[PDB]
């Protein structure tokens, strides 16, 4: 049980329920919502609100009085406050609407007076004149003050204050100078945070919520002898027959109205078999500005829950300003009927704008798929509509996949369909794929490339299609160096012997290649020679060569009769969480771009890299490939469809250098291998804008990235460290909760000395870094020096910002 | 002679004039404006538009058809185009309003078709569907195409195209595929730039300009038997007597209406002695939606310019939809009467909100002062109202100063009043002024400070109160170093001998001081020992010391019986245009902050520095004192009242280092001493938001600063150089045009090899720097090596970014 409500005898949206059954569409063009879904949308910051109050007698908090809502974030908290109130500074029109608190300067500490609905020099006498404070009605409390404030303990019982609204009329009641007498009994420490001003007005009549939602009318049942309007608020699942109206009237479900004569602003009451069958309400000279139920004609009555007739009642109803509360399952049946054809008309919307239900939230993915009979082969069909937003096309195909996996049947084929659609989604699409006869080298030379290695301070999986979806992200990361060499360095050379040898080190015997076979493209054997395969995907076709005539390929290209032999080197395993695979591939491509020709750009290097990273079939951790190639920023992932990829600009480091020296940084612990990653990129691509609060948390990762760059763009190194630890929290506790408790033992000690950290990139193995004050940092090096030392060793490794990172072709 | 106009028989704001006499208030709350003042506001980008067309037969361009206006900047030009059209992409409501051009992809090159007022699948058949283009009607032309396009040469004469509007109906006419036949005769090269979408709608009725201006009603003549409204458009200088109305009607001047019965949307015609005297128009059953003049009663006639009556005409006027153009000095008298009491009611507004006329533009400063009898002793009085915006207070005091200087009388006292008010304006105001007994040193030590030297790449005199005014600026500058030492370095020491010796080098014998006398504070003898005087202005008072008891000051403070002896060093004269004075002072204060105590911050160092820079009485070139102390950015001057001063955040340099090496920078020529500056800071502080297009150009200096930081925040070094040369243009050709032609000979050669430059800071002496491609740069060093070498030598000096810049107190 929670907030039951007040009397609130103004709004016609008060069918005899609580506050959960007046369904209203979303701002992103879906009709599956009300306060109840919006109450959930506010409950998520409200269940976020809990921190360090009590054990099980803490709270599960009573909801508000619903000044409307969903502007920016609460907290609105310090963990030693009983109560934190809300402040709002707007034009004094909303002062004249509802009550404003005001006190001494400074006001948001401890209230001294107020004025409910202020007008002129009275409002000026709210000294100081501009210390306004408008609450909206969700407060914390201590473990004590329940027994005084709301439900005051008397000798009879713990009776409420006789104000039925506890919150608003207590703040009206106790908000004056009796607070300076009264709140000193129950732990006087109180702070107040005010609020911004987005979507804050009230729920007076239906036009309030209409103006909030800007527009109306979605099911849409259009029977006949009706009247076309727009402004009128019809929600879902109301069969609208045979009645002529003017707008402002709202009609839910368990309501099949036929042949009436109605005007503006209509409550229409449910819970009953209401037709023009047995209620006998046909010749209905219905007045204006009143609330059904029963009022066939007359002037300005008051009849509540369904009083019964046949026809006789049509006479004494011009007796105005009288009160007859017409009352002393079928509403749940209204809800059940309303939720019956919801997925049906969602399929209709998946026909209508064909993503208006699908790629708007798809939020009820599993319950949409299973319940009730939603056949997502229609989603496969409209996925293959012609071609769409392949976003939306693949979204529908993945809805089909989500059904076929989720119901029972062909999850592997559902995954295959989603995989191929995912590829096809990224198959778009680039210049050219070309034909170019590379030449340069020339013979005697050796081309050696090299590259530093990113980490990502913040701006985490705002990369990785599905992004937001499209669009964009932003990461701002860095691009730094392990002590020397950068590492990740690639050598590539001509030879004599027309078989393209891929040659690796730390693993590599060789890869003798000329077949292609396809080309290259191999997720076939994951000898990371796989990555140079794709490095031959320059295009890697052309006229007019052939399979034997790699002879022609080389031996007109290079011409330099190589069968080129290309020899990489990574220093670190791919269990880094440093994107080393991606960076490595990119670096090879830069070497090719030098190597025999084709003349490209850093950016389009990374473009074509990402392009082949598609067919590399790893989830495109893509932040890195701009990161570790370039220098210490990234920033701005922006467009992400389909997939467009700028993202650039810069930042000073400079507090990673000129160095801080308030440490003067951060540095390394593996003791932990990776798992490696086989669930992580799943949770990424499960899903797109399908699910869930993922998408939510993703969005403020982006926000926190802009937080990051502004922070260190000012140089708040101490706050840089805060935001680092925040990002850690923002992924550890968030997606993805995989960080394996040995990591947490390395966190455990220390956590202390001084400040935060993160795992870069992947998480679940690899290695951290962390910032401290200053040489206590070196004593932390002494700490990890002391213990916690498996043979994955436990080092200072630095990191070492040092960067440009490219190639030589020397000499 | 210019744009006379079209027929345009819709808008009631068409009293028989051109387009200059329907006065409308400004967005910044003054009523002294119309298109004519707004035509000037558009004329300034229009006279900006001229570049490289012709000699004296170039143009002085015909004005537009007035889709309304004053969104963002034109150009909208390449200097080889005949005609550049305007593009606009909005909702197709304004497509249904007025004509849209559309062509192939890409559209903004050479037009192929159009559709005037498009509707549905017709508008979709503007292939490609979203290639819209809405012109607003000011084009260039070649030196040729006058004789074809507008006023086509025939055998009779050079007759116009029979379209009376040349522009709009020619673009309707020639904008189709007949352009692909026709515009190939007259230098076919044409490009098009589209536009943004701020304030673009039309002038259909009065509500259009009302919605544009959002609000109405300023003179305000309120006679009796009238009706209170708001929405009605009454401009200035209309005595409104004895008539009852509904809104939407507009009334100018030479109009003293009494006792009529009028409704909405009224043209009211001038040029005549119109009272209820001799026109005899009293019993006036005036209809709705028609245009005075003459219509006493009736239904929907058409009577133009003043047809004459007595009473008899009141009968055959229900003869609707008839045309009787009532026509086949006193309007200039209306303008003269309207401009008579304008300064009177400006004084009333200078009483009303007391800056609503004053510190809103004060734009007509000299003509406001002189014409006609505006006595600005009222501006002195309301300057001393109590205390105000001392912005507005000092603005009014300076309006008084502007009058007293400008009329004749007491310019020096007017300057004195403005000077004292300027001080008093900056006298506000800081913590504390304190009392602190500094202690630290200790004895044996020597405290040595040091500092690098700013230049300002862009973001020029957006510093320097008056800023915008208040608020703010932004400069982003750098903070760099001459080869070594930083210079500007200060030594300060205890001694034995209780007389505070200021000791300088390159000039300094000594300054033996203990008197104070005041304290310190000396614009008295400009031995730059003056600057250390203010450096003793710590506060520089306290309890409970006295004049002899600097004995107490020192000899309890330090205690260390010094009479402290403080010894600076500048390397460069104050004729640098590098703010060296200000930086120097600040550095001393940092040394004091170390020196004997008081424990401050960089920022509040600079705060208190600026505070004393007030009493230093130089115009506060203030950018520098944050600049050259800190490192290579500044950025964000923001608040500038009263005067608030954050301003911080950062940027990478990084293309001033890791160096470019596409030169890998810029460096020095004096051959020129300064004048020095005695007119420059005048033109700054002449004026505040008084005058002129200064304020305009100032604003886009700020814009160009954000341009700057974004540019090099991405690393567009080539465009960095563009924006440098732009800033040069933006001050040389702009405020202030003082750069003395020897400088321009050093510009002359080179200008060339490759790119631009500026004088930092002051200008009019000192030394530049300039960027080139790369080693052609060194050949420029060879160029200045070759010639142009006075004994103010002609060097490479670098610059040398190298920076933190503070102090030692070693050991």
From Swiss-Prot, chains A, B:
Gene Ontology terms for molecular function: ATP binding; fucokinase activity; nucleotidyltransferase activity
InterPro entries: GDP_fucose_pyrophosphorylase, GHMP_Kinase-Related, GHMP_kinase_C_dom, GHMP_kinase_C_sf, GHMP_kinase_N_dom, HddA/FKP, Ribosomal_Su5_D2-typ_SF
Keyword DNA-binding: no
Entry EC number(s): 2.7.7.30, 2.7.1.52
Cofactor(s) named in the record: Mn(2+); Mg(2+)
Variant or mutagenesis effect after changing residue 459 to A: Almost complete loss of fucokinase activity
Consequence the record notes for mutating residue 623 to A: Almost complete loss of fucokinase activity
Chain residue ranges for the region called Fucose-1-phosphate guanylyltransferase: 1-121
Known outcome of mutating residue 454 to A: Almost complete loss of fucokinase activity
Region annotated L-fucokinase, chain positions: 421-811
UniProt remark on cofactor binding: The L-fucokinase activity absolutely requires divalent cations such as Mn(2+) and Mg(2+).
Catalytic activity reported: L-fucose + ATP = beta-L-fucose 1-phosphate + ADP + H(+); beta-L-fucose 1-phosphate + GTP + H(+) = GDP-beta-L-fucose + diphosphate
Any GO BP: GDP-L-fucose salvage
Keyword Chloroplast attributed: no
Mutation effect (residue 19 to A): Almost complete loss of fucose-1-phosphate guanylyltransferase activity
SUPFAM superfamilies, per database record: GHMP Kinase, C-terminal domain, Ribosomal protein S5 domain 2-like
Top-level division of the source organism's lineage: Bacteria
Effect ascribed to mutating residue 575 to A: Loss of fucokinase activity
Domain commentary: Is composed of an N-terminal GDP-fucose pyrophosphorylase (fucose-1-phosphate guanylyltransferase) domain and a C-terminal fucokinase domain, connected by a linker.
Quaternary structure (record): Homotetramer.
Family: Belongs to the GHMP kinase family.
Protein name: L-fucokinase/L-fucose-1-P guanylyltransferase
Species: Bacteroides fragilis
């Amino acid at each position: 049980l929670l907030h039951a409500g007040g009397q609130s005898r103004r709004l016609p949206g008060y069918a005899p329920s609580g506050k959960i059954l007046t369904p209203v569409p979303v701002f992103r063009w879906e009709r599956g919502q009300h306060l109840g879904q919006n109450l959930l949308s506010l409950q998520l910051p409200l269940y976020e609100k809990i921190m360090s109050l009590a054990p099980d007698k803490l709270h599960t908090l009573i909801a508000s009085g619903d000044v409307y809502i969903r502007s920016e974030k609460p907290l609105q908290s310090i963990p030693e406050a009983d109560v934190v109130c809300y402040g709002l500074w707007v034009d004094p029109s909303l002062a004249t609407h509802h009550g404003v608190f005001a006190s001494d300067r400074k006001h948001p500490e401890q209230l001294d007076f107020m004025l409910q609905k202020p007008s002129l020099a009275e409002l000026e006498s709210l000294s100081k004149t501009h210390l306004f404070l408008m609450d909206i009605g969700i407060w914390l409390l201590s473990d004590r003050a329940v027994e005084i404030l709301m439900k005051r303990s008397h000798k009879e019982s713990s009776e409420e204050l006789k104000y039925y609204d506890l919150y608003s009329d207590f703040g009206l009641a106790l908000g004056t100078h009796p607070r300076i007498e009264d709140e000193e009994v129950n732990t006087l420490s109180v702070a107040i945070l005010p609020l911004p001003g987005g979507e804050f007005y009230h729920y007076g009549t239906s036009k309030e919520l209409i103006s909030s939602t800007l527009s109306v009318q979605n099911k849409v049942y259009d029977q006949r002898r009706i009247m076309h309007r727009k402004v009128k608020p019809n929600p879902a699942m109301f069969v609208q027959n045979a009645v002529v109206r003017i707008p402002l009237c709202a009609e839910n479900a368990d309501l099949w109205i036929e042949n009436s004569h109605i005007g503006p602003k209509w409550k229409i009451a449910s819970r009953h078999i209401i037709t023009g069958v047995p209620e006998n309400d046909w010749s209905l000279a219905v007045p204006a500005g009143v609330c059904v139920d029963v009022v066939p004609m007359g002037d300005k009555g008051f009849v509540a829950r369904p009083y019964g007739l046949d026809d006789v009642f049509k006479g004494d109803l011009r007796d105005s300003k009288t009160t007859l509360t017409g009352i002393p399952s079928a509403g749940a049946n209204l809800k059940r009927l309303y939720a019956q054809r919801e997925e049906f008309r969602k399929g209709n919307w998946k026909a209508l704008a064909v993503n208006h239900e699908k790629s708007v939230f798809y939020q009820l993915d599993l319950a949409d798929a299973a319940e009730d009979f939603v056949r997502l082969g229609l989603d496969m069909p409209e996925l293959l509509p012609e071609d769409a937003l392949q976003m939306s096309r693949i979204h529908n195909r993945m809805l089909r996949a989500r059904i076929l996996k989720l119901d029972g049947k062909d999850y592997r084929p559902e995954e295959q369909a989603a995989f191929d659609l995912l590829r096809d989604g990224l198959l778009d699409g680039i210049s050219n794929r070309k034909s170019t006869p590379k030449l340069d080298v020339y013979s005697d030379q050796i081309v050696w490339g090299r590259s530093p290695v990113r980490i990502d301070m913040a701006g985490g999986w705002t990369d990785t299609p599905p992004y937001s979806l499209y669009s964009g992200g932003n990461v701002v990361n860095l691009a730094i160096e392990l002590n020397g060499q950068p590492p990740l360095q690639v050598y590539v050379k001509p030879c004599k012997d027309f078989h393209i040898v891929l040659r690796s080190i730390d693993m590599g015997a060789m890869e003798i290649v000329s077949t292609f076979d396809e080309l290259q493209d191999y997720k076939k054997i994951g000898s990371p020679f796989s990555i140079p395969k794709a490095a031959l995907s320059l295009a890697g076709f052309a006229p007019a060569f052939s399979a034997v005539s790699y002879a022609s390929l080389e031996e007109q290209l290079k011409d330099f009769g190589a069968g080129i032999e290309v020899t990489l080197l990574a220093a670190i395993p791919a269990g880094s969480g440093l994107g080393t695979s991606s960076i490595l591939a990119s670096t090879v491509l830069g070497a090719i771009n030098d190597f025999c020709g084709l003349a490209w750009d850093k950016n389009e290097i990374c473009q074509r890299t990402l392009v082949l990273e598609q067919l590399l079939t790893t989830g495109g951790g893509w932040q890195d490939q701009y990161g570790g190639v370039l220098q210490g920023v990234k920033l701005l992932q922006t467009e992400a469809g389909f997939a467009q990829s700028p993202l650039v600009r810069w930042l000073p480091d400079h507090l990673f250098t000129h160095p801080e020296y308030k440490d003067c940084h951060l540095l390394y612990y593996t003791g932990i291998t990776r798992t490696a990653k086989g669930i992580l990129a799943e949770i990424v691509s499960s899903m797109f804008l399908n699910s869930s609060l993922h998408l939510n948390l993703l969005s403020e990762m982006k926000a926190h990235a802009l937080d990051m760059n502004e922070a260190i763009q000012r140089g708040s190194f101490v706050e840089f460290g805060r935001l680092v630890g925040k990002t850690w929290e923002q992924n550890k506790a968030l997606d993805s909760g995989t960080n394996p408790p040995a990591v947490e033992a390395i966190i455990d000690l220390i956590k202390d000395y001084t400040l935060g950290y993160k795992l870069p990139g992947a998480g679940g193995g690899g290695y951290l870094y962390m910032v401290a004050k200053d040489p206590q940092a070196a004593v932390r090096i002494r700490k990890i020096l002391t213990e916690n030392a498996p043979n994955p060793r436990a080092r200072f490794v630095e990191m070492t910002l040092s960067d440009k990172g490219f190639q030589v072709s020397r000499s």
